[PDB]
Design a protein around this ligand. Structure first.
Ligand SMILES: *[C@@H]1O[C@H](CO)[C@@H](O[C@@H]2O[C@H](CO)[C@@H](O)[C@H](O)[C@H]2NC(C)=O)[C@H](O)[C@H]1NC(C)=O
Ligand SMILES: *[C@@H]1O[C@H](CO)[C@@H](O[C@@H]2O[C@H](CO)[C@@H](O)[C@H](O)[C@H]2NC(C)=O)[C@H](O)[C@H]1NC(C)=O
Ligand SMILES: *[C@@H]1O[C@H](CO)[C@@H](O[C@@H]2O[C@H](CO)[C@@H](O)[C@H](O)[C@H]2NC(C)=O)[C@H](O)[C@H]1NC(C)=O
Ligand SMILES: *[C@@H]1O[C@H](CO)[C@@H](O[C@@H]2O[C@H](CO)[C@@H](O)[C@H](O)[C@H]2NC(C)=O)[C@H](O)[C@H]1NC(C)=O
Ligand SMILES: *[C@@H]1O[C@H](CO)[C@@H](O[C@@H]2O[C@H](CO)[C@@H](O)[C@H](O)[C@H]2NC(C)=O)[C@H](O)[C@H]1NC(C)=O
Ligand SMILES: *[C@@H]1O[C@H](CO)[C@@H](O[C@@H]2O[C@H](CO)[C@@H](O)[C@H](O)[C@H]2NC(C)=O)[C@H](O)[C@H]1NC(C)=O
Ligand SMILES: *[C@@H]1O[C@H](CO)[C@@H](O)[C@H](O)[C@H]1NC(C)=O
Ligand SMILES: *[C@@H]1O[C@H](CO)[C@@H](O)[C@H](O)[C@H]1NC(C)=O
Ligand SMILES: *[C@@H]1O[C@H](CO)[C@@H](O)[C@H](O)[C@H]1NC(C)=O
Ligand SMILES: *[C@@H]1O[C@H](CO)[C@@H](O)[C@H](O)[C@H]1NC(C)=O
Ligand SMILES: *[C@@H]1O[C@H](CO)[C@@H](O)[C@H](O)[C@H]1NC(C)=O
Lengths: 409, 71, 182
């Protein structure tokens, strides 16, 4: 008989840090002889550089696929009256120095030496798309899904009022427009309460943004492990080539250099393999996030537990550091009530199966109600179709029907 | 990459600094990526130019509470 | 080309090491070649496994796309192509598949004036399918995807409640098909 509108937040990683690893500087810097031996050792450096270049290209393509999905950039109107809705939390604020929303301003503040790694041949390439471009894409997506609904996802954008779009979504999930057009203020208040509650939950609990923090911590731990593995001795007399060059002559240091490379290149290959596995996992997560964006942001999906738990209505995308944040607005009914039901009734020798819903009774009279909402309506011939007789239907009950042509006579 | 031109048609970006390519204020659909919202392209005489990315075609939707558009 | 590398030995071919060096002192050279040739083989197998996993994921996605766009009609947005997808043509490709998605893209927009509901005499008439639009003089019932002007009747509108809580109501009349009979 009632409902509770709640907002569910889903965090999905999109991309990671693009790292380019030097060969000569990481293995043995300022050493011409070590570079000579290294080249003889083979062409591992070209393969590793190609692998990291392909990883960076894959991450770049993933970012462009997940975020850059609309051909045109839309702009919100200056004055906002979306049927009395508090959309200022998700809309960009011109008062802030950045174009990110205050929800996004809380989002980037919950996600966290580089010179030592930069010196030893480990460089982090900056992402191709800046945060401003991602924020502009998010604002364009929000403007498209608010001021035009889901029509902009398929083709050109068609303007439509927000209550009219909400009624379209209710008709998509099977709820009539009577519930929206009779309880619009209650729905707006419930949405505002859910937005405030999820904002307070995001502010109070920092453990919600865990996957992006886990990815960042894993990358930092891998870099620190690589540095400490550079610090390893690898069974030689010393862990630095300068000491071996100063102590040993080159012919006697040939074996020590060979023992260093056999193991330093192995650590490089292990790091490349771990980065490839992490990139494959990030690619799967980014494909899932792009599918979720295209099937919840650009339209309404009837699939259960894909666009959030419950009857999904719409999702608001949010920009996140190295990821995306979805605000799934779902329809959760409440305030249940027991009733007495029958599968079919027959008035005079012929069954009258309902077109939509089932027949329910409060104890004395039978009425026609919908599947999700309790709207008592009189039984007529408009919502019931006749087929056969009530001789093979199990659980039949005798009742009368109302004919609109009867008062005419 | 990561090296400023001070230590080394000169333009600098977040990734570093580049030479041989001029800067164009107008933003088109770029082809060759550079880094941090910058691109490079070969346009008109003919020379390599650098410019920021176009986010997309501008299209402002007039929102009203009593009007609709149907194809 | 990695087979052509010396890999820390004096030669890149085992025949030269066999001819020049006797077997006992060439044990070290053969072991140094194997430690590195087996590692290159393991790296090649790992790269092939990663590529095969990526190809397997792509093939699973392609099989799902075939089963949900060719064998049936999917209501999922931007899964069977951009726009309102109808039916797709599978095609044969070298080491791959080609989908010819046929989509429905509307065009030629036209502005109109719309209302959430219309009540005739104290009772609201919400439409079943389509919405009320007006060109300036009269209101008509057209569907969402196409502009099909139809007169408002009681067949496509259901009566529920009164027009006292509906925001943006407008006063208009309705056509009753039983009225010309009387
Ligand atoms: C919808 O909610 C927003 C909250 O983000 C409202 O903005 C605040 O409104 C109150 C009262 O109107 C002001 O005291 C605050 O200063 C506003 N916030 C800021 C940051 O300026 C917005 O007014 C609401 N919309 C309505 C009530 O129509
Ligand atoms: C359906 O639920 C809503 C919210 O859960 C109820 O609205 C509340 O009504 C009480 C009673 O006056 C108020 O004190 C609250 O402030 C309301 N909350 C909101 C968010 O509007 C509503 O009354 C319920 N309807 C029925 C029939 O039980
Ligand atoms: C079930 O609901 C119906 C509809 O509200 C009830 O019928 C009404 O009952 C009241 C109280 O006796 C009468 O004043 C109305 O005239 C009745 N309306 C109709 C259309 O018959 C019915 O009483 C309810 N039954 C139970 C057991 O609660
Ligand atoms: C609904 O009404 C019909 C007809 O009045 C009932 O059918 C009768 O059931 C009795 C009980 O066995 C038989 O003796 C009659 O011969 C039946 N008549 C006909 C015409 O079939 C039926 O039982 C009623 N159902 C309920 C649930 O009350
Ligand atoms: C709005 O549309 C209606 C129906 O298409 C137009 O009404 C028609 O107007 C022509 C012009 O005189 C008449 O010949 C038709 O008989 C009318 N049809 C009906 C059903 O009334 C109306 O003129 C249009 N209004 C505007 C401003 O374009
Ligand atoms: C549709 O017509 C009804 C009936 O004339 C209008 O209701 C009147 O509204 C005025 C202004 O509030 C009141 O002074 C009258 O007492 C109302 N009469 C009745 C019978 O309710 C209604 O306002 C009209 N709606 C529109 C949108 O024009
Ligand atoms: C309906 O009655 C059953 C008892 O048979 C009870 O267990 C159930 O909780 C009732 N439903 C509601 C919504 O209270
Ligand atoms: C429900 O099941 C019980 C137990 O078998 C049976 O006695 C009763 O007649 C059934 N009711 C209907 C309407 O079929
Ligand atoms: C290079 O140095 C100048 C002078 O301080 C500075 O303005 C500029 O940002 C630097 N560029 C880079 C890429 O560090
Ligand atoms: C409808 O009118 C608005 C101005 O209110 C305009 O921005 C829009 O382009 C118009 N659409 C059509 C299809 O004429
Ligand atoms: C649309 O919004 C404007 C601005 O608040 C308001 O004046 C107008 O009455 C609204 N129209 C309807 C039909 O609600």
């Amino acid at each position: 008989t009632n409902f509770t509108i709640s907002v569910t937040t889903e965090i999905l990683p999109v991309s990671m840090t693009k790292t380019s690893v030097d060969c000569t500087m990481y293995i043995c810097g300022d050493s011409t002889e070590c570079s000579n031996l290294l080249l003889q050792y083979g062409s591992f450096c070209t393969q590793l550089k190609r692998a990291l270049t392909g990883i960076a290209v894959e991450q770049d393509k993933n970012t462009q696929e997940v975020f850059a999905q609309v051909k045109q950039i839309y702009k919100t109107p200056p004055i906002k009256y979306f049927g009395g809705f508090n959309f200022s939390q998700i809309l960009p604020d011109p008062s802030k120095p950045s174009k990110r929303s205050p929800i996004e301003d809380l989002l980037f503040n919950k996600v966290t030496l580089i010179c030592a790694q930069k010196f030893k041949g480990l460089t982090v390439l900056p992402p191709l798309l800046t945060d401003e471009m991602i924020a502009q894409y998010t604002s364009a997506l929000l403007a498209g899904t608010i001021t035009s609904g889901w029509t902009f996802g398929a083709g050109p954008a068609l303007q439509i009022p927000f209550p009219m779009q909400m009624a379209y979504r209710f008709n998509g999930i099977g709820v009539t427009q009577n519930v929206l057009y009779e309880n619009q203020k209650l729905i707006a208040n419930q949405f505002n309460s859910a937005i405030g509650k999820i904002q307070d939950s995001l502010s109070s609990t920092p453990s919600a943004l865990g996957k992006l923090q886990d990815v960042v911590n894993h990358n930092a731990q891998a870099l620190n492990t690589l540095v400490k593995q550079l610090s390893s001795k690898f069974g030689a007399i010393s862990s630095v080539l300068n000491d071996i060059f100063s102590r040993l002559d080159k012919c006697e240091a040939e074996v020590q250099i060979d023992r260093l490379i056999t193991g330093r290149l192995q650590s490089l290959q292990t790091y490349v393999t771990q980065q490839l596995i992490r990139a494959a996992e990030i690619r799967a997560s980014a494909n899932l996030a792009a599918t979720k964006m295209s099937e919840c942001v650009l339209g309404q999906s009837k699939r259960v537990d894909f666009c959030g738990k419950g009857y999904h209505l719409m999702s608001f995308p949010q920009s996140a550091p190295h990821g995306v944040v979805f605000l799934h607005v779902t329809y959760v009914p409440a305030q249940e009530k027991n009733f007495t039901t029958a599968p079919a009734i027959c008035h005079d020798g012929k069954a009258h199966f309902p077109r939509e819903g089932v027949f329910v009774s409060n104890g004395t009279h039978w009425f026609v109600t919908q599947r999700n909402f309790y709207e008592p309506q009189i039984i007529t011939t408009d919502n019931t179709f006749v087929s056969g007789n009530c001789d093979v239907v199990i659980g039949i009950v005798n009742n009368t029907v109302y004919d609109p042509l009867q008062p005419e006579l | 990459q990561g090296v400023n031109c001070t230590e080394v048609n000169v333009f600098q970006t977040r990734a570093g600094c580049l030479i041989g390519a001029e800067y164009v204020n107008n933003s088109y659909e770029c082809d060759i990526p550079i880094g941090a919202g910058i691109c490079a392209s070969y346009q008109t005489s003919q020379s390599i130019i650098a410019y920021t990315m176009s986010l997309g075609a501008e299209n402002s939707v007039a929102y009203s509470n009593n009007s609709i558009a149907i194809p």
